Amino acid sequence: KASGTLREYKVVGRCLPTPKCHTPPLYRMRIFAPNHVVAKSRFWYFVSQLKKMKKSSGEIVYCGQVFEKSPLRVKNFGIWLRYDSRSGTHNMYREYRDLTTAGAVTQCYRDMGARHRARAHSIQIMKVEEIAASKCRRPAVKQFHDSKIKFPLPHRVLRRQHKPRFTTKRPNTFF
Template sequence: MKRATGEILNVTELFEHKPTKVKNFGVFLRYNSRSGTHNIYKEYRDVTRVGAIAQMYDEMASRHSAREKSIHIIDIKEIPAKLCRRANTTQFHDSQIKFPLTHRIPRNGLYKSVFSAKRPHTFMC
């Protein structure tokens, strides 16, 4: 928030009751785009509300070119799985979830140097 649009009245750090449990968060927010003001609802999966909001700021900046100063968080709620609406959230609601990592880039050891005699193996089955 810009200094011209508001004033900080209170600062409270949010501590999570269960910071090791994966939860779904629904975020209601209002933001000013280049052409107008929009109310939107977004969902995130995270272990903390703070993490979910951080994800939200990143996503708003990337998808909507909205910076922090133009975003106004209306509400954030932890929501049960059955009330989740977004496919990107519900696709991970599966206790039998299973997917491979298709393209792996080794980041340590052999490939630390700029030049290497061996090509890296990026496909790990």
């Protein structure tokens, strides 16, 4: 699985009706994927591990993108995951701040790649919950729970270094 900006998909599937049980149970999953093709593939990957289901012996009865309910509210997300390192398998709890669940999960994938060199095929998201600020544990997240938060932008780096490429004046950093 590659990435992009992830979206959340509610995928509902079941086994094909057989002359053993006519109505099999319906199973629902939250899948964070670039598109619905990848979402269906990951759904089958997970239900094959959990239940004894297969793409051939089952069908997907629903796959729809779950829009964020409050995309204008800042919130804290706690993500429980498991990933394969080079020498073992570990469970991790991570915390992020975002406006969207899929955005926070994208943050998690970028962060796992940055800090643990973990690829998306190694990572396996198993829980995403909007947590309260009082329930947050990571200091990087907790330092933004300040009603009167205030900080400058100290060392502004010139980004239009080539417009102009040559100039008399040396750039200013303090603003």
